[PDB]
Amino acid sequence: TEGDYVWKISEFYGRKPEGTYYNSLGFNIKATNGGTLDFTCSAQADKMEDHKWYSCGENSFMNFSFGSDRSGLLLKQKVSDDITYVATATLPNYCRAGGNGPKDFVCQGVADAYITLVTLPKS
Amino acid sequence: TEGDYVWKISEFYGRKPEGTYYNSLGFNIKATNGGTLDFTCSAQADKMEDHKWYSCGENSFMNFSFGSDRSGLLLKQKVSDDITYVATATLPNYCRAGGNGPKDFVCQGVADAYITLVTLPKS
Amino acid sequence: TEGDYVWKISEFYGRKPEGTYYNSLGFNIKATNGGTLDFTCSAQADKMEDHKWYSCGENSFMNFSFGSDRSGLLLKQKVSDDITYVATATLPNYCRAGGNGPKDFVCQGVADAYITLVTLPKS
Amino acid sequence: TEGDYVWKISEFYGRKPEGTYYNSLGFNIKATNGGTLDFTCSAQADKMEDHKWYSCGENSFMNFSFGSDRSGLLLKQKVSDDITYVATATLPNYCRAGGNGPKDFVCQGVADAYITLVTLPKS
Amino acid sequence: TEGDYVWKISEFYGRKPEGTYYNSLGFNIKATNGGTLDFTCSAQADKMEDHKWYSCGENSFMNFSFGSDRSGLLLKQKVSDDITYVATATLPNYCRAGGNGPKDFVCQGVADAYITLVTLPKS
Amino acid sequence: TEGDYVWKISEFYGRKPEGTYYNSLGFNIKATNGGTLDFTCSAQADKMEDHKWYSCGENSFMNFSFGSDRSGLLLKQKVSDDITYVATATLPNYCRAGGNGPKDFVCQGVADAYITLVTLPKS
Numbered sequence: 001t002e003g004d005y006v007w008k009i010s011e012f013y014g015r016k017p018e019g020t021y022y023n024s025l026g027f028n029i030k031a032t033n034g035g036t037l038d039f040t041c042s043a044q045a046d047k048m049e050d051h052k053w054y055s056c057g058e059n060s061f062m063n064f065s066f067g068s069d070r071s072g073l074l075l076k077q078k079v080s081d082d083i084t085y086v087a088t089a090t091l092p093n094y095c096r097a098g099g100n101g102p103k104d105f106v107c108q109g110v111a112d113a114y115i116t117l118v119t120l121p122k123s
Numbered sequence: 124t125e126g127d128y129v130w131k132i133s134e135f136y137g138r139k140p141e142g143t144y145y146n147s148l149g150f151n152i153k154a155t156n157g158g159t160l161d162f163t164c165s166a167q168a169d170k171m172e173d174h175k176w177y178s179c180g181e182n183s184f185m186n187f188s189f190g191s192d193r194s195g196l197l198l199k200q201k202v203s204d205d206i207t208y209v210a211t212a213t214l215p216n217y218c219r220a221g222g223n224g225p226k227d228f229v230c231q232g233v234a235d236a237y238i239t240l241v242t243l244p245k246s
Numbered sequence: 247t248e249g250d251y252v253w254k255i256s257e258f259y260g261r262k263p264e265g266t267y268y269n270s271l272g273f274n275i276k277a278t279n280g281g282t283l284d285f286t287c288s289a290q291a292d293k294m295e296d297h298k299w300y301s302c303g304e305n306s307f308m309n310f311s312f313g314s315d316r317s318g319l320l321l322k323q324k325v326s327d328d329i330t331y332v333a334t335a336t337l338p339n340y341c342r343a344g345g346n347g348p349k350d351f352v353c354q355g356v357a358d359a360y361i362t363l364v365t366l367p368k369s
Numbered sequence: 370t371e372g373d374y375v376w377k378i379s380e381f382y383g384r385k386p387e388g389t390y391y392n393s394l395g396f397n398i399k400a401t402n403g404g405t406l407d408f409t410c411s412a413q414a415d416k417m418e419d420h421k422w423y424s425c426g427e428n429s430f431m432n433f434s435f436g437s438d439r440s441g442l443l444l445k446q447k448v449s450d451d452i453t454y455v456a457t458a459t460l461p462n463y464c465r466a467g468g469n470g471p472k473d474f475v476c477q478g479v480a481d482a483y484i485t486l487v488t489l490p491k492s
Numbered sequence: 493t494e495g496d497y498v499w500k501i502s503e504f505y506g507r508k509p510e511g512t513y514y515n516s517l518g519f520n521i522k523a524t525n526g527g528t529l530d531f532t533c534s535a536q537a538d539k540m541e542d543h544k545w546y547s548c549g550e551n552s553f554m555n556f557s558f559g560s561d562r563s564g565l566l567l568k569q570k571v572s573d574d575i576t577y578v579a580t581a582t583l584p585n586y587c588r589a590g591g592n593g594p595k596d597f598v599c600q601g602v603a604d605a606y607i608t609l610v611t612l613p614k615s
Numbered sequence: 616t617e618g619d620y621v622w623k624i625s626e627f628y629g630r631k632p633e634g635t636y637y638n639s640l641g642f643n644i645k646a647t648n649g650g651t652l653d654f655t656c657s658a659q660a661d662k663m664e665d666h667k668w669y670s671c672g673e674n675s676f677m678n679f680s681f682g683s684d685r686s687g688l689l690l691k692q693k694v695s696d697d698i699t700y701v702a703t704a705t706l707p708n709y710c711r712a713g714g715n716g717p718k719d720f721v722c723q724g725v726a727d728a729y730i731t732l733v734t735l736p737k738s
Binding site: 128173174175188190196197209210211213239241242243244246 | 316
Binding site: 317337338356 | 370371399401
């Protein structure tokens with residue numbers, strides 16, 4: 001499970017303020033082949049949508065899409081005007097109370113994932 | 124390895140006071156699908172037996188059975204008078220000295236496990 | 247993935263005569279460590295129910311339960327009046343037309359499973 | 370390894386007429402949860418390019434892209450004008466003489482893959 | 493599970509003429525990355541010993557050792573006087589009657605293995 | 616993934632002082648079957664070589680060989696003048712700055728590995 005195109009997804013973090021929709025999501029991305037990538041992708045909104053592109057940060061050139069249904073992750077990354085990588089992952093997690101409300105919840109991943117990057121056709 | 128019927132077993136803990144039989148066993152059980160289960164199952168006895176049902180706690184409605192031979196775990200849970208789940212797992216571990224005796228040992232799991240629940244026929 | 251108490255489950259087969267309930271179910275069990283076990287477990291009923299013990303065959307001293315819900319299998323072997331082992335698996339499968347009436351379906355496994363037997367406490 | 374949005378990819382097949390580019394590629398997709406999907410996706414071109422969408426077949430409403438570099442597969446299913454799913458796999462394979470001219474090669478998968486579909490955002 | 497130095501081991505075959513020691517052993521090695529390697533490694537002796545190097549065949553420049561204890565395989569390829577690679581696998585198998593005398597047994601693999609080659613230091 | 620011959624490799628640590636060659640390497644080895652092995656194997660040199668035997672410590676009776684190319688590990692252990700075990704593993708990792716130089720780097724493993732021991736023929 002190493003390789004120049006394999007990444008370790010880890011440290012998944014979610015905030016469900018009314019116990020339903022996320023208002024915050026993030027995770028960490030690490031190199032696997034002794035490379036140097038150690039990046040925490042993260043987004044916030046008042047009511048985040050399933051199956052919607054969000055940026056991971058300004059100048060990250062990365063976007064993700066999340067489906068809370070089955071905790072599925074879509075990951076995309078522009079590398080040039082010609083190369084784009086994409087990857088799918090699943091991110092197991094549990095929730096515990098957040099105390100910033102009655103129905104406030106904190107979601108933490110309970111397992112790491114290892115994605116393989118594929119090149120997205122320019123179409 | 125997510126799902127509404129998948130659980131993460133973790134934080135395995137054992138006490139072998141004379142270096143043989145356990146006198147204490149426990150582990151943690153977490154949800155995997157963003158659910159809320161975060162429970163530490165645990166039992167104690169002067170000399171615990173292999174292949175014997177033990178409660179995980181009062182009002183847990185859960186019992187487990189352990190086989191120290193191959194570190195195998197049986198997990199059972201009453202959900203109603205009609206539904207009972209069971210699962211099998213294996214729990215790798217090592218021991219280190221406990222210092223509360225010459226042949227005292229502490230056992231800690233070295234890997235998480237992911238069980239799938241099946242329904243136990245009422246027979 | 248080998249061992250004295252590890253078995254391969256394969257060749258899963260069921261019939262849905264009206265394309266709903268099974269009226270026949272079966273699979274094969276092989277040894278894994280150079281043992282000699284190569285046993286085909288199978289059962290029939292007019293309409294089979296999920297989560298109900300069925301015999302694997304006369305003088306097999308084995309029983310199983312199946313949940314078509316999540317393709318969960320529960321396996322039980324009586325070795326003696328004093329020793330019983332159990333195990334759990336998931337059996338991925340697909341369906342297709344059986345040819346005996348338009349609503350007739352045949353289900354086949356599409357993936358091997360490897361089970362680990364644990365001792366069931368007596369009482 | 371089962372689910373409503375889990376598919377088995379198997380029976381991978383490609384032709385390298387001069388033993389370099391593919392001029393034909395295909396594989397099979399089956400359901401995993403007792404579903405009925407058993408679809409063979411295949412495409413041809415004079416010389417196929419890596420990282421380019423190809424149709425799986427007329428009225429399949431499916432497309433795929435393949436990278437012979439790392440045997441990466443990208444799969445896309447249009448379910449409606451409003452819903453599209455995607456998935457990623459790696460398809461281990463080997464080559465051998467095809468017999469139609471000395472430089473002719475045939476590639477076969479040597480391992481099944483199991484994909485998980487996620488929803489692709491619209492826009 | 494692909495790579496330039498990843499091989500599939502399959503089609504394991506041994507003969508226990510008296511149902512104890514092997515007097516014949518073999519398996520197949522295939523490439524995994526669209527390579528062309530499809531080599532069948534096999535050896536015979538009057539009575540074969542565990543944990544002893546055997547040749548895979550004349551001018552194969554390969555050797556293996558097998559432990560019927562835990563079905564462990566050790567594989568060695570001499571590429572040149574300067575480069576040797578090694579790898580390790582476990583080969584799940586079962587036995588059955590061979591038909592050539594009552595004590596005659598045939599062993600077959602029941603699961604593929606995927607090995608990773610590493611360089612063996614010289615000296 | 617337990618067994619009397621299975622070990623957990625963990626806590627991989629590497630030092631690449633000029634950003635290339637390692638000058639230090641180490642990792643931890645733990646029992647998996649409730650045994651007592653908890654050992655940190657480690658070596659240092661001004662410029663460490665790929666594919667070279669290094670001791671894990673005085674009186675460890677263990678040597679390893681590393682290939683930084685694909686982060687592959689060879690592990691060997693003398694148990695008597697008659698028994699020697701060997702195992703192969705792969706050890707995913709990433710690097711971050713070390714600050715003891717411009718091109719100084721610290722490598723930490725990002726995933727555990729589970730090796731199976733095989734017996735090395737005496738030849």
